[PDB]
Design a protein around this ligand. Structure first.
Ligand SMILES: Cn1c(SCC(=O)Nc2ccccc2)nc2c(=O)[nH]c(N)nc21
Length: 266
């Protein structure tokens, strides 16, 4: 299983660690952080200029472009690493691809006006993530009759929507969207049944690093969640998840080697 973008490819025969690069001189530092994550073994950098917590500011198109595009460019020029852009805005999707972005990672699965068309035109890989509602309201009272079945249904419909716009199935990644309109119970149901999403024959991407599903279980703050984050990452990668989105790259990469050695022997 492979992905293709910007003339290169990503070989998904082993788990990949995707390092988080938040962009909120800013440019000097982002590049430094990207370099460390690459030295620690990250094969993808996820660049994002808009926060997804409920009180977060709606960032304007011009503010998001100013923060994200120079970082994406500066990485594609310096390094061989793949670049994921964490945006919902067609303009950022377009401008990101023009300066070397390899993956469109949209928490809203191209629901914004023009995002679907913009993504198709780039020809890049697209991640389709599940969220109930939207970031400012999704955690109030998340509800499912059956959370696995409903996330599954959502992937069926969104793959179809992507194909209808000329985005081939082979471009797509799927992500159950841990913490995106889900309580503690919902998150763990999804993680326990993650391997069952393989029936789509598509790369699974997961993001659980330092999240509330760990925080509520250990009753600790974000800085104290590493062990819980590694446990999540290992549980996911053992079930065949292809890309793991994390803050702590060195440690996750180390844990992924142990998983890979275990999977190779199986
Ligand atoms: C951009 N993005 C995010 S941002 C939220 C976050 O990191 N929260 C958070 C960070 C630190 C502490 C607590 C919560 N989560 C995902 C995900 O799970 N999947 C994909 N594909 N993209 C994603």
């Amino acid at each position: 299983m492979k992905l293709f973008a910007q003339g290169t490819s990503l070989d998904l025969s082993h788990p990949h660690v995707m390092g988080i690069l938040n962009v909120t001189n800013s440019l000097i530092d982002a590049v430094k952080h990207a370099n460390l994550m690459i030295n620690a073994g990250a094969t993808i950098i996820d660049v994002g200029g808009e926060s997804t917590r409920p009180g977060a500011a709606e960032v304007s198109v011009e503010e998001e472009l100013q923060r994200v595009i120079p970082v994406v460019e500066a990485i594609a020029q310096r390094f061989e690493v793949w670049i994921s852009v964490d945006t919902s805005k067609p303009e950022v999707i377009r401008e990101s691809a023009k300066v070397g972005a390899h993956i469109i990672n949209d928490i809203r699965s191209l629901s914004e006006p023009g995002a679907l068309e913009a993504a198709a035109e780039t020809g890049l890989p697209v991640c389709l993530m599940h969220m109930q509602g939207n970031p400012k309201t999704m955690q109030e009272a998340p509800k499912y009759d059956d959370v696995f079945a409903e996330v599954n249904r959502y992937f069926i419909e969104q793959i179809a929507r992507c194909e209808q716009a000329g985005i081939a199935k082979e471009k797509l990644l799927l992500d159950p969207g841990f913490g995106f309109g889900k309580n503690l119970s919902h998150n763990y149901s999804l993680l326990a049944r993650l391997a069952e999403f393989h029936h789509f024959n598509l790369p699974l991407l997961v993001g659980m690093s330092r999240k509330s599903m760990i925080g509520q279980l250990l009753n600790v703050g974000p800085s104290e969640r590493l062990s819980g984050s590694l446990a999540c990452a290992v549980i996911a990668a053992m079930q065949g998840a292809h890309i793991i989105r994390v803050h702590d790259v060195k440690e996750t990469v180390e844990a992924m080697r142990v998983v890979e050695a275990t999977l190779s022997a199986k």
